[PDB]
Curated annotation (Swiss-Prot):
Sugar attachment sites: 35, 111
UniProt-recorded name of the protein: Interleukin-19
Induction: by DNA damage through pathways mediated by JUN and cGAS-STING leading to production of the cytokines IL1, IL6, and IL8.
Phylogenetic placement of the source organism: Eukaryota, Metazoa, Chordata, Craniata, Vertebrata
Disulphide-bonded residues: 7-100, 54-103, 55-105
Superkingdom per UniProt: Eukaryota
Keywords per UniProt: Apoptosis, Cytokine, Disulfide bond, Glycoprotein, Secreted, Signal
Subcellular localization, as worded in the UniProt entry: Secreted
Length: 153
């Protein structure tokens, strides 16, 4: 049913949000293409129906885990510790989502997702990874609006 919005309830948005707030300035300060958004799809209302939101959520989690987190090399240990915490949260969110799931990807959801990979691939890889990292607020806002998520805020 609409329950697909309950697959991340065990995730604590506040936890991720806080870890991110800690490095948000330092990471966003390195965004070399501010006039553009890698998560452009998440600034539109193209993905709002339950089934599409579930598909895009799992695609975005994989986008971060398999692409962003692999591509960003972080020499600052304090920043890396925060990003590890976020990464750990995302791994949990993927675990939770597995447990849940329907969640199939209709062609519109799939395309919405490819747009992001396509924007990402427009940039040099390290700039793409740090910029994506900087857009975590766009990702958290979208997750927040489309899922019953818990907050210890
Ligand atoms: C991004 O910035 C450029 C710079 O002039 C401007 O055309 C507009 O604000 C944006 N352009 C696009 C479509 O990326």
């Amino acid at each position: 049913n609409h329950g697909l919005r309950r697959c991340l309830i065990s995730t604590d948005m506040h936890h991720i949000e806080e870890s991110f707030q800690e490095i948000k300035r330092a990471i966003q300060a390195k965004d070399t293409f501010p006039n553009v958004t890698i998560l452009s799809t998440l600034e539109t209302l193209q993905i709002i129906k339950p089934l599409d939101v579930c598909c895009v959520t799992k695609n975005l989690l994989a986008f971060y885990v398999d692409r962003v987190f692999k591509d960003h090399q972080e020499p600052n240990p304090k920043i890396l510790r925060k990003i590890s915490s976020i990464a750990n949260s995302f791994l949990y969110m993927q675990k939770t989502l597995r447990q849940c799931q329907q969640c199939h990807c209709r062609q519109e959801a799939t395309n919405a997702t490819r747009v992001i990979h396509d924007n990402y691939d427009q940039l040099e890889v390290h700039a793409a990874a740090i910029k994506s990292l900087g857009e975590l607020d766009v990702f958290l806002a979208w997750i927040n609006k489309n899922h019953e998520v818990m907050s210890s805020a």
